Every structure is written in structure tokens, then in C-alpha cells.
Design a protein around this ligand. Sequence first.
Ligand SMILES: Cc1cccc(O)c1
Lengths: 21, 30
Amino acid sequence: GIVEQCCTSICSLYQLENYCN
Amino acid sequence: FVNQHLCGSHLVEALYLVCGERGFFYTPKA
Ligand SMILES: Cc1cccc(O)c1
């Protein structure tokens, strides 16, 4: 769901950090 | 589904700048 989470509505840098290693 | 295709190109780029030295794995799913 990265895509469903971020392509349907905008993601913040901060939600983005969660897909980091 | 060139649309998700367009979108993940920009997402991996935001991820590259956000994860920095840590990396990230990019799954087009789950
Ligand atoms: C930073 C960024 C890139 C592409 C899509 C988004 O929801 C967010």
C-alpha cells in the first residue's frame, strides 16, 4: 500500500520515513 | 496504470531524499 497510501492522497516527508530502513 | 507508475517514480525520489544514509526498500505493493 505505499502507492495506495501515497498516490491517492499526498504523503508528508514524515509519513515517508516509515518506508525507510 | 501509467498513473501509479508516474507516482512511484516521484515517491522513490522522496524516499531517497528522506531515508538518507539508511536506504529504503521499495515495494510497489504489499
Ligand atoms: C513526496 C511525495 C512524492 C510523491 C507522492 C507523494 O504522496 C508524496
